[PDB]
Amino acid sequence: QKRGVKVLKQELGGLGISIKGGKENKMPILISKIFKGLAADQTQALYVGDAILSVNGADLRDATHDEAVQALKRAGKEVLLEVKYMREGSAYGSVKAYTNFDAERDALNIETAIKTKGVDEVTIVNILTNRSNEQRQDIAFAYQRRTKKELASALKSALSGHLETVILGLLKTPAQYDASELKASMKGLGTDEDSLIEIICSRTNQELQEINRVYKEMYKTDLEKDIISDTSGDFRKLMVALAKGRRAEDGSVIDYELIDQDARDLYDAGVKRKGTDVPKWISIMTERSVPHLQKVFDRYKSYSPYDMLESIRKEVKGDLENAFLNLVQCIQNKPLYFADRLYDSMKGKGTRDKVLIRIMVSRSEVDMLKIRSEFKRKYGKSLYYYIQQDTKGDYQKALLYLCGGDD
């Protein structure tokens, strides 16, 4: 959305911004910093990550760094910027960026909340669950700058129970959270295959590329190597292939001939023969793009008397079956996949808090709004309602904030 912002230069700082990039960096001219208390700050209309397309009519779309600097420095007192937020994100998350964000004020209020007698969890929850993940990182930075202590450690001491689990999860970057959840699922004598499957089967190529990098940075070992240590058989081969994050990207053309051939190959490898050609299933379901596989699974119904999910249940068992079932759901309808997992986490006696928390934290800035739509459509009551009946206290309030509201 191209928008126009008028900035009045001040003799201290000028526009009061810093810029990055240029065509020699294969980047568009991007606002990198907005200095507190300067010209562009007082407009409250520009955000870090904005692409400056023109300055008083002077086009900057194909400008180098120096070309943009000279154009920005030359412009008179009144400056009209045509900007366009080019930072990629999702419009279907429930947690949005707070519109009056002050990282120092939040850090100071969180310090006050922690030091208050009995701890003011309400304020801590009201702040952190109503800031984007990027804003939380800025709060963590300002907290360390003012108090000289790390925010995550301070909150771990102040909080306990499920509330601590939610808050500490919210403080990690998305890749950090997934990496630490993957490490947790491969800790001790046993293995949490359900949690391992949920993350590996649902994460995209871009998300997995970042997880693989951050995992090695955090634990000094490759994620694939830890997967190999804690899994075996065809389940290992499927998990290792998926975790590589090298699925084919969604192309422009629809390959109908390959859609039909994949459908026949999936049929020949399973329902048509005794046993299963598991490597063939792994190759097709890990290499093809998601839109392609959606059409493959429908074309598969033309050849097989059972659909892909029912075919998996009849062909394989154990962890391998659970992996394929989760993967196919993520391909067909990922928001419905998470809606169903949320329902299973609460429907019965007690709560599967680990799963409930992990989904509310990890999907809150991705597709929580679609999850909520699928949930309300299938179960008749909102996700908000189900969280209300299964959780209590400040833990409940934090989850309700992450939910975002009723349906």
């Binding site: 700082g13 911004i17 810093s18 810029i19 990055k20 990039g21 960096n25 910093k33 600097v69 420095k73």
Partner: peptide, 7 residues
């Protein structure tokens, strides 16, 4: 190049 320039 993480080159920044103030303007």
């Amino acid at each position: 190049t993480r080159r920044e320039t103030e303007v």
